[PDB]
Every structure is written in structure tokens, then in C-alpha cells.
Amino acid sequence: MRLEQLQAFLAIAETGSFQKAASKCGVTQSTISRQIQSLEADLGLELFHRTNHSKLTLGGERLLPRARKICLEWETATQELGDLIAGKQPELCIAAIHSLCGSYLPPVLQKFCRDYPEVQLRVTSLGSDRALKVLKDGLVDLAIVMNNRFLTTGRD
DNA sequence: TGCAAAAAACGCATATTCTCTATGCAAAAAACGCATTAATACGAGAATTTTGTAGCTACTTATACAAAATTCAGGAAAATTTTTCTGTATAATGGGAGCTGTCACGGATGCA
């Protein structure tokens, strides 16, 4: 089921000479045909045209459900670790408190704008006992509450 | 039983330092390519050859007369049982069985 035999023999299943698997998938006639000769038995259905000529017998067009769906997951990964940020491109959630959400740092908004202008942002609540809970985990993606709490997370 | 108060502990001055987060090493997997050999399949040849079709032939049977060799329904004897008829010889000489305690009605006779 693995990638090379998956993607190789299947898109084979609509073409061969395994020269078709070597292309698109990558597995050459070497590790494809040899491993697929024994694999032709492991899911339990003849995929290509057993050394014949042109066929779609029981390839992977009907095996990808229990097959491709998986490696489509890492196919999204095969694309890239995202485009902006590796994980959760939008990750800038500010604290909800009654002190300083509004007005003390407009040159920081300047630099954020200078490095990246009008960039969408988000928010969470913390508490300050609950800020503690969710910052020693680091929930509050950006977090500000009396430093006398929330102590754990990474880097001590 | 109110504190003023002392010494040692318990809180603001750093060494240590040691789990700790942090990149380059290295060793063997793996998988990709050079590729080689063999095997899976295309080409030709004429060989078997079964099936498909015709006429002949042998088996199988359609049928037309009827007394086959056997079944049966009366017909007329017996056979024994049973039925009807006829006969048996002293004298014998008038028949029992409840009704008698119902109330009331409607004729129908008898009886002076």
C-alpha cells in the first residue's frame, strides 16, 4: 500500500511497462514490478495486466479509498508546511483585559505594519489565574497578565 | 495577657550547574539506475478435425379381423334345514277384578 507501490501501480492501472510507475510515482521497474509481483497478492486483487497488454483489471482506482486517502493526507503535506507560517499561518491572539488593549503601543502596530501591513489578527481570553493555566501551556497566543503567574510552557 | 523584641531563620544580594535545547557525524538502509537475462507473448504453418448436411436403412409402430385362452351370469338339479299341515282316543260340564274421596258443565233421557 505504501507510496511507491500505491501511487506507482495505480496510476499504472490506467498505463505500464512499469515505466509509467517510474514516472509520476518514482518507483522504477526495479522496486516496483519486483515488489508489486508479490504485492499483486497482498491486497488480494490483480491490479495491472499480468505481463499482458493494456488493462484496468483490479488496480488502485478502487484501492485508493483505503489507500490514497491516507497518502492524500500527506499529499497536502507533500505540497508544503503551509505558505505563511508552518503551522496555523494566522496565530496572533491577544489577551482580553480591561487595562491596555487599546492605546499604549501604536508604534508597535507601526512595525508590525512595516514588517507586514494590515495583516489579519485574532484574540483569546486569558484570566490571570486562568491566564496562568493557559500560558504555562501557552494557549494565549500573545499573552499579558500579572507576570506573577502562567509560569511553564517551553524554555522554562 | 496588652508587646517589645532577639536570634535565628527566611527572604534580596550571586555563584554554580546541571537538565538541558541545540547541530554537525556517521553508518547502514534503501532505492535508483546500469543493466542483463529470461520469459511472456506475437508470427507462421498446415493438421487435426468436429460440426453440419445428405441419403439410406433398420427398427418401430399404425392399424384392421376377430374368437385367442379365460371370466362370468344364469339355469337347473341336489342338500339340508325349516315350515306348514295333519295327526295322536278314560273323564274332564258358566270368568276374574277393580270402581266406590274431584269440581263443574251440557245435554239426554226415564218416571211419574
From TrEMBL:
Keywords: DNA-binding, Transcription, Transcription regulation
Signal peptide (from-to): none
The HTH lysR-type domain, residue ranges: 1-57
GO cellular component, one term: cytosol
Entry's Gene Ontology molecular function annotations: DNA binding; DNA-binding transcription factor activity
Keyword hit for Cell inner membrane: no
Family (UniProt): Belongs to the LysR transcriptional regulatory family.
Name this protein carries in UniProt: Nitrogen assimilation transcriptional activator
Part of the intact protein present: 1 to 156 of 312
